[PDB]
Structure formats: C-alpha cells, structure tokens
Scaffold this active site. Structure first.
Site, short mmCIF file in Angstrom:
data_model
loop_
_atom_site.label_atom_id
_atom_site.label_comp_id
_atom_site.label_asym_id
_atom_site.label_seq_id
_atom_site.Cartn_x
_atom_site.Cartn_y
_atom_site.Cartn_z
N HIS A 95 4.70 6.96 6.55
CA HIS A 95 4.51 6.45 5.20
C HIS A 95 4.13 7.60 4.28
CE1 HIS A 95 0.44 6.12 7.08
NE2 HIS A 95 0.13 6.77 5.96
N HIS A 117 0.83 -1.21 0.00
CA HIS A 117 0.00 0.00 0.00
C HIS A 117 0.86 1.26 0.00
CE1 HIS A 117 -2.54 -3.10 2.20
NE2 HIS A 117 -3.26 -2.84 1.12
#
Ligand code: CU
EC number: 4.2.1.1
Length: 257
Positions: free
Chosen positions: A91, A61
């Site tokens: 992230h 992801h």
C-alpha cells in the site's frame, strides 16, 4: 473509529489503541548521522519471481494490493531477518504536497510518498498469528520522489479509476512487485510497529536508502483517490501518513557506510 482527520487522526489513536504510546512505535525519523552501520548484516534477499497478486482495494485508508501468501512465492529473507517472510500486501502513504507524504523521514526530510511492502514470518502459520509476535512482520519501506515515470507503478496508476472510493476493489493479477524497487538495496533497519491501528509492535522495519522516482502525472493520480465511500462528501485520500514517533532506546542500523 480512526482515520487521518482532525477528530480521528494519529493524535487520537492511543485511546482505542494504548500501544500508540509504546516503546517501539513507527514510523521514526532516521538520523543518518547516528545510524549504526553494521557489516554483520547478511545481504537483503528479495525473491519476487513467482509472486502472484490477487486484488487491489481502497479500504478508505489507502489502496492495497493483496497477494496469495499460501506458499513461499514472493518472499523476503536475509538482511536482519531470520527465516522466511511472505509478501501479503502493498500500500502507499501519499501527501498533498511533494514535500510530504512519507511516514519515515531521513534527517527530518519527508518524501512525496512511501510504499510499504508487508511480509510475515512463516514460522507463525499465517499473518493473523504473525502480527501477535515481536518478529512477526518484515515491512519494506520505499520512498517516492518525483522524477521519471515508474513503469511498475503505472500498473497501479492505470487502475485507480476503478477503486476511487472506500470499499471499491478490482482484479489485480499478474502484477510484478519487482517493478517497485530502486536500483540499490541499501537499507536502514530497526524494530518497530504497524503504523495504523492496531499499531502492533510486530515489525522489523527495512527502509531502503534509495527512493524510486515517479512522474508528476503519476503522483497527481495517486492523490485522486477518496477516503469516503461513493455518494458521501468527497474527501481526497491525501496525507494518509502517521508522523514520526519517539525512537526511545532503539538503535537504527545501516547496511551501508
Ligand atoms: Cu503503511
């Protein structure tokens, strides 16, 4: 399952996770003309001095830098927060074109990317317990816009080859997250949720007004990761962002006028 594709993308998430249509979902568009400046907000305190990174991984992801959150090493406090919030993960959401990539938007404007520094409320013991609380997480959002190379990001850039496909991970110790912050700590804040399943509405969002810059080369490299696992058809990890959600009856506050 879920992803950002046509058949498992954001528009499908609500069937596995009904909360996708809840009252405090993220991200949202930040209308600078309706955001309420609040001088009562204590200043944002970022203490990443003894931060201790552990690993960086491609979970299919996004790339994720994990930290040791067993103690108050890299913490966030102040601003709209009560107590201490420990950094656990960082992230990035990136687009395929420079004009898109961010999850939060400013006056509908989208940035090339958005960094999310995830922290959790220490009064809850650990991250797993924290996500089950309305005030369990504090996520710092930083927009990325093309400009001069960002040294703090080059550390990540330099390791991308090692985690190109889903499931790949690498050692990432001695990484200083302070290198990911813009000059100004001015921010917007509002109650929201995780932007990927399970989409739990457990986060106090703190979105910095000042985006950091990254070079064109850096952005290009951040678009070379894969969603797929090694050996499967190559699917570039681009446009892994959730679009803006209905603000409903939430008020976005500004820490600056
Ligand atoms: Cu995120």
């Amino acid at each position: 399952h879920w992803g950002y594709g046509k058949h498992n993308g954001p528009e499908h998430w609500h069937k596995d996770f009904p909360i996708a249509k809840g009252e405090r979902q993220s991200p949202v568009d930040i209308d600078t003309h309706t955001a309420k400046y609040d001088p009562s907000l204590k200043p944002l305190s970022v203490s990443y001095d003894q931060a201790t990174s552990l690993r960086i991984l491609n979970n299919g992801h996004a790339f994720n830098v994990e930290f040791d959150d067993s103690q108050d090493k890299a913490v966030l406090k102040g601003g709209p927060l009560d107590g201490t919030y420990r950094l656990i993960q960082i992230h990035m959401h990136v687009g395929s074109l420079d004009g898109q990539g961010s999850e939060h938007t400013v006056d509908k404007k989208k940035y090339a990317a958005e960094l999310h520094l995830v922290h959790w409320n220490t009064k809850y013991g650990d991250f797993g317990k924290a996500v089950q609380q309305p005030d369990g997480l504090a996520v710092l959002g930083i927009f990325l816009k093309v400009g001069s190379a960002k040294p703090g990001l080059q550390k990540v850039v330099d390791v991308l080859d090692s985690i190109k496909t889903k499931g790949k991970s690498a050692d990432f110790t001695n990484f200083d997250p302070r290198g990911l912050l813009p000059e100004s700590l001015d921010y917007w804040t509002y109650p929201g949720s995780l932007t990927t399943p399970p989409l739990l509405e457990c986060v106090t969002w703190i979105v910095l007004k000042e985006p950091i810059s990254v070079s064109s080369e850096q952005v290009l490299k951040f678009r070379k990761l894969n969603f797929n696992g090694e050996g499967e058809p190559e699917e570039l990890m681009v446009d892994n962002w959730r679009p803006a959600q209905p603000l409903k009856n939430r008020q976005i506050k500004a820490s600056f006028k």
